[PDB]
């Protein structure tokens with residue numbers, strides 16, 4: 026839709042210029058060696074190299090000088106949604122599966138509430154690292170139908 | 182058998198019947214027998230093709246750097262120009278593999294079902310052992326004994342490891358791994374993962 | 379080279395003598411006489427290699 | 428194994444006090460000093476005993492490596508300068524390579540030892556020619572002619588608990604010495620022998636309160 | 639002693655330490671990768 | 681047995697003093713590879 030990358034646009038350069046300009050104008054109110062002034066210059070070069078990094082990864086860039094994600098599915102601009110999306114999905118599946126497995130395990134006790142408030146940190150530690158199995162394991166579960174239930178609703 | 186931890190007790194999952202048992206499951210994945218079978222077959226196929234791949238990486242590189250031959254790098258062979266364009270050979274690969282692998286899977290689901298070549302009725306197949314197919318695969322009449330399956334699986338595991346090493350070292354470097362070996366032999370201390378970061 | 383290559387042999391011989399000395403009487407030429415001795419690879423490996 | 432129960436056989440670290448009941452005194456180096464009662468339960472007790480032994484041995488090695496080169500610098504031929512600044516000394520290789528090799532090898536070894544602790548006797552190195560019966564273990568004292576080739580930890584040279592007492596006491600002292608050296612270098616800028624001689628010359632004033 | 643262990647295994651303190659560790663990890667990542675907007679690895 | 685073992689450790693490594701006279705034996709290993717360590721001898 027006409028969004029040029031700010032490796033080439035101008036308003037991005039204007040934003041960068043104004044930001045570093047106000048920062049520099051603020052910088053000249055101390056000693057050129059004072060640790061606060063040093064950190065100020067540090068943040069200056071930091072935001073500068075940020076602008077540089079943004080001007081390195083195909084970031085299509087708005088008509089007002091701002092990045093703008095492209096989540097349309099085209100893997101050309103995928104370093105914004107697709108790969109971080111699947112990464113977070115992996116993490117979330119990790120957490121969900123480990124929690125579910127812990128609960129299913131600890132269900133078999135006298136009053137599982139006492140272990141739901143005060144976790145079996147030993148069992149918790151020997152159950153927790155199983156995350157690397159969450160895609161495949163649950164998979165087999167659904168294959169064997171051991172993931173859901175049919176007509177057991179209350180009680181257990 | 183050789184529990185890779187001289188103090189830990191092996192879980193009941195890996196008794197020792199299957200080749201290459203060492204109780205190496207600190208995460209209790211295959212504690213279900215059918216999934217254990219699944220991962221047995223998966224390890225078999227991954228190891229075989231990893232051996233294939235690591236050979237196809239290493240041997241061409243050294244034979245080229247030896248001056249006897251001339252062939253591009255395994256990564257530098259894609260853009261090379263052959264008698265056939267990429268897509269052609271790729272779709273032929275796709276159809277042939279969608280035949281062979283689906284037959285393999287049908288054998289996996291059903292022991293001893295898809296045995297015969299369904300074209301001609303003789304010449305077909307002697308009944309096999311799952312993961313270790315029959316005649317037309319072992320022409321030299323090798324006896325499928327122990328110390329053969331164990332050697333196979335060990336070589337294949339190390340091959341998997343070496344292939345992942347090839348891939349990640351090409352990622353960080355993009356160079357020929359044998360050149361990395363030469364630089365290594367120059368000075369193992371001055372040539373390692375540390376300096377290249 | 380010969381210094382170590384001989385000191386090792388002397389110490390090994392002493393060890394062999396004191397190992398077999400309980401079987402034969404406490405006596406030189408009844409021990410340290412390798413014709414009634416002979417064949418110890420099975421009994422004392424670490425001092426044999 | 429000899430016990431040191433209450434009484435004259437039990438010189439209490441705090442005279443006129445009954446030591447904590449769960450502090451029997453079996454472990455050499457015991458005097459009934461655990462006001463915080465961390466050794467309350469036996470598993471924690473043995474775990475802390477192992478930690479204490481390891482700390483003591485490592486501290487002995489560390490204090491030797493501090494002391495000896497500095498004095499051999501002061502008066503001996505070779506001049507090993509400030510050990511605290513030897514951490515950043517420049518060698519053939521980078522510090523991170525050294526770090527990763529140290530970690531690999533020490534992980535191997537200490538993991539074998541860890542499994543021995545968790546499972547005694549199941550991970551041991553003691554060959555067996557025929558008809559010669561090997562010794563057992565007491566973890567923390569492996570035995571056999573790998574770490575006791577002098578045959579000192581078994582009987583003859585001294586009743587065992589006495590020698591282990593010597594070891595644990597010297598180890599506590601060496602821990603104090605290491606923390607003292609480090610804290611001094613935090614405050615002062617010399618080695619241990621330098622502070623020592625400075626104190627010798629002016630005992631009355633050249634101290635921590637000198638400034 | 640074991641009493642203080644079971645007390646330490648009570649969800650408040652365990653949760654506080656877990657969240658502290660996670661927040662430390664996140665702030666350290668942010669330190670070592672300032673402003674980290676895209677996925678410039680692949 | 682401890683001295684026997686430690687001296688066995690000597691009766692194999694010491695040969696590396698005057699190891700050989702054909703390029704030493706290695707292009708790396710800067711620990712006096714092809715300068716064979718009997719350089720203490722005359723001059």
Ligand code: CLA
Nearest residue numbers: 342343345346347349350353361362365372373374375377
């Ligand atoms: C068959 C296995 C194998 C072998 C022979 C090598 C060999 C080598 N690798 Mg390598 N590597 C491997 C697997 C392997 N790698 C794997 C699986 C990974 C991914 C984690 C890597 C990641 C890697 C990186 C990122 C780099 C190397 C580099 C190197 C070279 C210098 C050594 C170094 O820096 O440490 C290797 C560093 C590693 C992290 C390797 C870990 C391998 C694990 C621990 C298993 C190997 C254990 C094995 C039993 C011991 C070696 C066997 C060998 C003596 C036969 C050297 C030629 C460096 C290079 O090319 O610069 C010259 C470099 O920058 N490797």
Ligand code: CLA
Nearest residue numbers: 119120121122123124125126127128144148149150152153
């Ligand atoms: C691992 C445990 C776990 C799992 C697998 C699920 C799974 C699910 N929840 Mg859920 N939930 C949980 C814990 C869990 N929940 C807890 C603790 C709460 C209370 C805060 C809720 C409150 C909740 C609500 C209100 C709703 C769901 C819903 C759902 C369903 C859709 C996903 C969703 O909207 O979640 C959204 C994500 C959350 C709500 C976040 C909760 C996840 C927590 C933070 C993880 C807990 C982990 C554990 C306590 C920590 C211990 C770690 C381990 C060492 C033991 C899905 C079946 C929805 C539903 O009905 O779908 C049909 C819905 O409306 N959940």
Ligand code: CLA
Nearest residue numbers: 603604606607610611614615622623625626633634635636
């Ligand atoms: C074995 C124990 C020991 C010994 C013998 C010494 C000896 C010395 N220290 Mg020292 N120190 C120690 C432990 C020890 N320290 C510990 C544990 C710390 C950490 C708090 C320090 C921190 C420290 C600093 C910051 C400084 C010294 C300094 C000195 C020197 C001058 C004396 C002085 O003013 O400090 C007096 C030391 C203290 C008040 C530390 C108290 C702690 C010890 C353990 C007191 C207990 C006495 C001991 C248990 C009984 C004797 C045991 C044995 C020696 C017989 C002197 C050589 C100074 C220096 O560099 O010299 C010029 C200096 O500036 N020390």
Ligand SMILES: CC(/C=C/C=C(C)/C=C/[C@@]12O[C@]1(C)C[C@@H](O)CC2(C)C)=C\C=C\C=C(C)\C=C\C=C(C)\C=C\[C@@]12O[C@]1(C)C[C@@H](O)CC2(C)C
Nearest residue numbers: 205206207208209227230231233234237255341342344345
């Ligand atoms: C490493 C690997 C798997 C490793 C998995 C491991 C260790 C899992 C271990 C565990 O599960 C256990 C055991 C027990 C759990 O409790 C603990 C964990 C740790 C969870 C698979 C690699 C598997 C690697 C494989 C299969 C590689 C195949 C390579 C091929 C086919 C190469 C092809 C090419 O080289 C050619 C042929 C021609 C070239 O020109 C082009 C190309 C295409 C590049």
